[PDB]
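Researcher: I'm comparing several assemblies side by side, and this is the next one on my list. It has 439 residues spread over three chains. Same procedure as the others: predict the full complex and return the structure.
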Amino acid sequence: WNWFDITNK
Amino acid sequence: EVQLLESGPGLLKPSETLSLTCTVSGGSMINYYWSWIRQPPGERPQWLGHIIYGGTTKYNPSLESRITISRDISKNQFSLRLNSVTAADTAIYYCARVAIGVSGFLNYYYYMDVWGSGTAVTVSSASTKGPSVFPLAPSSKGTAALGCLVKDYFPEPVTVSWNSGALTSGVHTFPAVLQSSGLYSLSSVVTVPSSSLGTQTYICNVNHKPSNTKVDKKVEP
Amino acid sequence: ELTQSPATLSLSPGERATLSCRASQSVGRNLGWYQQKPGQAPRLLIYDASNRATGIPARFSGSGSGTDFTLTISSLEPEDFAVYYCQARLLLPQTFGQGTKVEIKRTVAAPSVFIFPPSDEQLKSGTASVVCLLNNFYPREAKVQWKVDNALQSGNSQESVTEQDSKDSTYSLSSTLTLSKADYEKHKVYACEVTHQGLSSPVTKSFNR
């Protein structure tokens, strides 16, 4: 989650 | 205890640029996301956007054009910039910690688990001005009501006390309303024994800090 | 989006409060409840449907999954009278629901009504504000109307309502009618007319300029 947005699809 | 504190100027005119900073204390920035939220008077909170430890951002599509969020890990801070403000950007702005994590296969959880204190932002063409304070005199006709009208000030807030704060019982100080003029107005009233109106002094103490104005008004029949 | 119902719950300290939140599309167990006390930031209350946030009193619980969620307060305390919001993931445009306000229920109390003429001080400055006060009433719904030499007014007044009083759980409301000194000087009788559940019929307070 720290480098790539976990709230994208 | 992790603590967030918003900082930055809150009084803007339309077309200007809002610039706020959140400082995080008592905890690390890694493994959480970092959000700006705002809440206009009498409305629910509105999520503005967030930034992740890595620097990637995500914004509310209704602000996309005008918003930027940034973060400085070395300084334990993250910031909001909102361009081209209007009166509609008036609100209490909060920075908040977001607890995030995996929930299902391609699902997540997102909870704003630590909130800062909030900072009141006003956007208006109006110019700062201290109030005029008029008596609401007790009627000449058991219990009587009297008060002070605190009129034509900008921006919020003012404070009102009665008799240096010694009189609190039966006091009601109303929320300010924004007038068509762009200045605020409010009233403060108290109910008291009719019998006292001859002997007892009633004085409202009004303070408006944005104008360094401090007024005492004696209210008499 | 999220739908909260009802908008207001009116209950006594001691009773059980049940709050609903329905999501339009499923969100698993990933819904949160937040509490907001007046002039304070919201705070996390329940997360993942049923998990008390750190520090939250055991009287607070949460249930549901997918579509239908409930926040229960087993036995209300004075400090729990507040607004409660739900929120699931990062749904937009509205990440939060509209909120449910939990108000203290009390016995009906009619407004005590007072009218105040403008002061000579303000008139000197060229403006007249006429104030009508509806004091200490419950429930909050109240109607106020201005009449000037018997003509019904509209558009030249503004009202404001207090939050529930900490001791007596009533509300109070001010209505302020504003007009120019010249306008004020061309009429004689200023009156406000108040309607409320607790008034058998409407009450009028008035003065003659």
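Model: For your comparison table: Chain A touches chain C at residues 7 (CB under 8 Å).
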